[PDB]
Amino acid sequence: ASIAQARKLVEQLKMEANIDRIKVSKAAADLMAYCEAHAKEDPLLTPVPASENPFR
Amino acid sequence: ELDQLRQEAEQLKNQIRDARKACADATLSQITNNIDPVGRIQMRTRRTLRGHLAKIYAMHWGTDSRLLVSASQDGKLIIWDSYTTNKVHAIPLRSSWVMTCAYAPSGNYVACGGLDNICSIYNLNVRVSRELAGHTGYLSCCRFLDDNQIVTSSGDTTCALWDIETGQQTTTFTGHTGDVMSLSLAPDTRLFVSGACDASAKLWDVREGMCRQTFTGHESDINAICFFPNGNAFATGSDDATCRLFDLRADQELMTYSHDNIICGITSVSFSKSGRLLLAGYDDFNCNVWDALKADRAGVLAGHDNRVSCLGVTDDGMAVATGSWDSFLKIWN
Amino acid sequence: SLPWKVLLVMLLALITLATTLSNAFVIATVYRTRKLHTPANYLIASLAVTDLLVSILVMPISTMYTVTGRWTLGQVVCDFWLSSDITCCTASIWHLCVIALDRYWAITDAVEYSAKRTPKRAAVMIALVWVFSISISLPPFFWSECVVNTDHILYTVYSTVGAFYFPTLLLIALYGRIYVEARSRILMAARERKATKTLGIILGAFIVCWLPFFIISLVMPWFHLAIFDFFTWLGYLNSLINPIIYTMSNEDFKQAFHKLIR
Amino acid sequence: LSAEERAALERSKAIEKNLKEDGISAAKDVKLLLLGADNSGKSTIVKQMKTGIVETHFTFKNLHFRLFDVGGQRSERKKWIHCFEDVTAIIFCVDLSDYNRMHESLMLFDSICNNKFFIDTSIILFLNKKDLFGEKIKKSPLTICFPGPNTYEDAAAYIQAQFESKNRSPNKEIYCHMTCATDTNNAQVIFDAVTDIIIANNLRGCGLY
Ligand SMILES: N#Cc1ccc(N2CCN(C(=O)COc3ccc4[nH]cc(CC[NH3+])c4c3)CC2)cc1
């Protein structure tokens, strides 16, 4: 009963351990590149024109 | 046996912690210091959707970014029109309480649940299509994968994928310690995440049905969670009054958004179309608009009197709609 | 003398502005705050509206009347000012006993009256007072200084009793019954102390301010008019005292008032 | 298509009329939270008056009532409680003929009494199984819970006093009552408690009390 929870946790921890982890600088560059790519496309980031905006 | 298993699990956690620290050469705050910030930008209140009696507990936009659904404690689930500020549907619920709501990407089915322990689906006359009854505890969050499939979290400590046509659980996601509060699907709809009461998010696999990796940045219970537009990161609101960004590739906490004045926990979080702006709805009647990279509040939204419950940005990213316990949905632009 | 007049003009203009300032915020707080939209609060709001109309219609004309002691705005405006003065201070009087009648049913009946209380039934009570108020000022239209026109003594005795002594007899009878219902609910002794202070300030402020003036009505159907001018502004002093009492008792408004203006 | 927009507005006119009629009906009704320990006679009082949440829809003395008995949750208690912060009164059941109940329930009572949402909400304490308690105290008294003499009047009063002790809140009257197992008209006690609560709120709003 108690061993089954530890065995399931150990099996989950074993599966979660063996993974291809990468650097923060590499990952953060991908997030920064995505935000810069869709910077013009975003209505909220740079405020949209009143004609194109449906609510205005 | 028990001690040996615990020692082996602790060694794996220590190896995991060492692997995350080895990857972390630089920080997100460091590399984005040179980047110019958003600045003093705050969206104006476009609409004020007045037609709820009790506290609104959840809301969700459609795919079109036209109609938005909103569930409330009145025992009423209203489908609004954002353009026309007008009622499209008003579905009377079976149970008066409702802690979650969803609206299909096809724009056909509408899901809801709460203390019933049932994810009641409604096909757009309106009536119950398939009452998804198979959870031990309260339904905390739910989101549509497709017109057929739908995923749910619960207070039973276990999320579960469903099939609307059959009316049964396809696969059960087990892993958390405390009650699961929120979930968020990826754009691909192949993987998803879920924050829980035990201060830990967990990345799942839809087809496989297994926990890929765990994230442990927060101290207090995670209330909300939301994916980053690309599908390689996510933010999480917690009871500790700190939003925390995480990377799926890096498998660690990238950045923490917080302030000393902000004492109360976060209720709901959502990114913009680009993912530069990270909005977050707090328990002090406000909703601060954080910059995801710069780690600073660009603006702040303060329309509601009572605490905001739900936060929903559109698919295209045209507008935001914050629901609240004041019983109002204020659309921002 | 002139320097005493400057102090008097400064005093009454300050009181006139203070009445306007107190009433304007109370009306604004009920309308602005979403939580305060209730049938109980609309009676307190309409009490502030009546007292606001005292501070706009009656007050600024009454300041010029006291200092000069001689009319200077035509006979047409004289006709409007006196009648409006009666209606506004008859509406302000009757609003308190209407709030008392609203509260009386809220305490003694409570479970029955909870269902009956609606914003429409609230609006009906305010309509009856304004219909009653204007009908007390309607009879005196039989026509240097702009005094009140005494001719039928039967109308004077009819006006004063209908527009004060009947509210007085009603209000004391209601709050007498409410206080007995309150003490029975209490019986702890510290609350009983508040129950006495709350009942005393609501009832006493009404009596102490107005009783001197409407007594003067029966005395002059005796002494010179210096004391009359004092009791008018003592009665208008009630109009700024009325909101601050009825708002002070309510915890939700007093919380809302500080939240609005820091 | 101006008629199409008018047809859409016509749908909302029906919805606005529907919501307004249903909302005022739900507003006048008395909403009650039925809390307590397991095997305390929570369902018994609901049955006497008349699987996550269990709703009730009984009426007594010209007023509609709504008892809500949470149970079988065993989750984070903080989440499902804030869903109904606007209940009129918290009905709290206690098993008298039971000591695990007595200490475990009293701790739960404290937390709900001390909860940020429910500090501005009255409690209606029900000390159930009074008939079984009277017989039970003779064999095994209330000496386990610190102290006083072993008697039905004294032992039941000290329990009521200990629940009353964990109050720590002005404007929050705890209304106590002892039902004989589950065979007495205790719906009138809920009415009598609620009548006092509504008047207490009307007084408190007025300035008195
Ligand atoms: N000397 C002198 C002297 C001159 C005039 C008066 N009057 C005051 C009382 N008289 C009335 O006609 C009664 O006036 C009312 C009768 C009902 C009312 N309800 C409200 C007011 C407003 C008074 N500030 C009001 C005034 C006769 C004129 C008394 C003494």
Q: What is the CATH number of the domain that holds C134?
A: 1.20.1070.10
CB contacts under 8 A, C 9-38 vs B, are: 34-35
Indicate the pairing of strand B242-247 with strand B233-236: antiparallel
Sequence-distant (6+) residues with CB within 8 A of B125 are none
- State in Å: Cα C217 to ligand 1 middle: 5
Q: How far apart are alpha carbons B289 and B300 in whole angstroms?
A: 5
Could you tell me if B95 lies within 8 Å of chain D, comparing CB atoms? Answer: yes
Q: How far apart are alpha carbons C234 and C168 in whole angstroms?
A: 17
Nearest chain B residue to A49, by CA:
B333
Interface test with C, best of B48, B305, B324, B327 (most C CBs within 10 A): B305
Q: How far apart are alpha carbons C8 and C67 in whole angstroms?
A: 7
Count of alpha carbons within 13 angstroms of residue A24, beta-carbon side? 21
Between A28, A34, A55, which is nearest B333 by CB? Answer: A55
Helix/strand number for chain A, H first, E second = 2, 0
Domain span at B196: 1-333
Q: Is B29 helix (H, G, I), strand (E, B) or coil?
A: helix
Nearest chain C residue to B328, by CA:
C34
CA angle B145, B197, B229 (to 5 degrees): 40
Structure tokens that stand for A1 in this block: 């009963």
CA-nearest of B39, B43, B49 to B302 is: B43
The CB density around residue C42, as the number of other CB atoms within 10 Å, is 19
Q: Which residues of D touch C199 (CB under 8 A)?
A: 208
Sheet holding B168-174, edge to edge: B139-144, B149-154, B158-163, B168-174
Sequence-distant (6+) residues with CB within 8 A of C211 are C168
Residues with CB under 6 A from ligand 1: C 85-86, 89-90, 147-148, 150, 156, 159-160, 163, 213, 216-217, 220, 225, 228, 232, 235
For residue C74, report the phi and psi dihedrals to the nearest 5 degrees. 75, 160
CA-nearest of D136, D146, D92 to D118 is: D92
What sign results for the dihedral spanned by CA atoms B133, B134, B140, B146?
A: negative
- State in Å: Cα C235 to ligand 1 middle: 11
Cβ separation C250–D207 shorter than 8 A: yes
Atom number, ligand 1, closest to the C-alpha of residue C235: 24
CB-based contact B169:B134 (threshold 8 Å): yes
Q: How far apart are alpha carbons D43 and D32 in whole angstroms?
A: 14
Structure tokens that stand for D160 in this block: 């009521």
Domain span at A44: 1-56
CB-based contact C42:C30 (threshold 8 Å): yes
Count of alpha carbons within 13 angstroms of residue C61, beta-carbon side? 19
CA-nearest of D91, D74, D206, D99 to D155 is: D99
Total residues found in chain B within this entry: 333
Q: Which residue owns the Cα nearest ligand 1 atom 10? A: C217
For residue B290, report the phi and psi dihedrals to the nearest 5 degrees. -80, 155
For chain A, the domain total comes to: 1
CB-based contact B308:B282 (threshold 8 Å): yes
One-letter amino acid at A40 equals K
For chain B, the domain total comes to: 1
CA-nearest of C166, C252, B48 to D207 is: C252
What sign results for the dihedral spanned by CA atoms C42, C43, C49, C55?
A: negative
Indicate the pairing of strand B109-113 with strand B329-332: unpaired
Q: Is B278 helix (H, G, I), strand (E, B) or coil?
A: strand
The answer, yes or no, to whether D and A have at least 3 beta-carbon pairs within 8 Å is no
The DSSP 8-state label assigned to residue B222 in this structure reads B
Chain gaps in chain D, named by the residue before each (C–N > 2.5 Å): 50, 147
Q: Which residue owns the Cα nearest ligand 1 atom 28? A: C148
Instruction: State CA D167 to chain mean position distance.
Output: 15
For residue D140, report the phi and psi dihedrals to the nearest 5 degrees. -130, 110
Provide the terminal-to-terminal Cα distance of chain D, rounded to the nearest Å. 60
Q: What is the CATH number of the domain that holds A47?
A: 4.10.260.10
Counting as contact any 3 or more CB pairs under 8 A, the partners of A are B
Indicate the pairing of strand B266-271 with strand B100-103: unpaired
Between C181, C185, C249, which is nearest D207 by CB? Answer: C249
Sheet holding B226-227, edge to edge: B226-227, B233-236, B242-247, B252-258
CB-based contact C206:C187 (threshold 8 Å): no
CB-based contact D155:D146 (threshold 8 Å): no
CB-based contact B37:B55 (threshold 8 Å): no
One-letter amino acid at C225 equals L
Q: How far apart are alpha carbons D90 and D34 in whole angstroms?
A: 6
Structure tokens that stand for B202 in this block: 């967990």
For chain C, the domain total comes to: 1
Q: Which residue owns the Cα nearest ligand 1 atom 8? A: C217
Give kind and range of the element (H or E) at residue B286. none
CA angle C51, C55, C60 (to 5 degrees): 160
What sign results for the dihedral spanned by CA atoms C119, C122, C127, C133?
A: negative
Q: Which fold has domain D1-209?
A: Rossmann fold (3.40.50)
Instruction: State CA B314 to chain mean position distance.
Output: 14
Q: What resolution in angstrom units was achieved for this structure? A: 3.8
Ramachandran assignment for A29, one of left (phi > 0), alpha (psi -120 to 50 degrees), beta (any other): alpha
Helix/strand number for chain B, H first, E second = 2, 28
CB-based contact D172:D119 (threshold 8 Å): yes
Burial class (CB in 10 A: 0-12, 13-18, 19+), C201: middle
Q: Where are the alpha helices (DSSP H) in chain D?
A: 2-28, 42-49, 77-81, 99-113, 130-139, 152-165, 187-206
Cβ separation A38–B293 shorter than 8 A: no
Structure tokens that stand for A46 in this block: 């740079």
Q: Where are the alpha helices (DSSP H) in chain B?
A: 2-23, 28-31
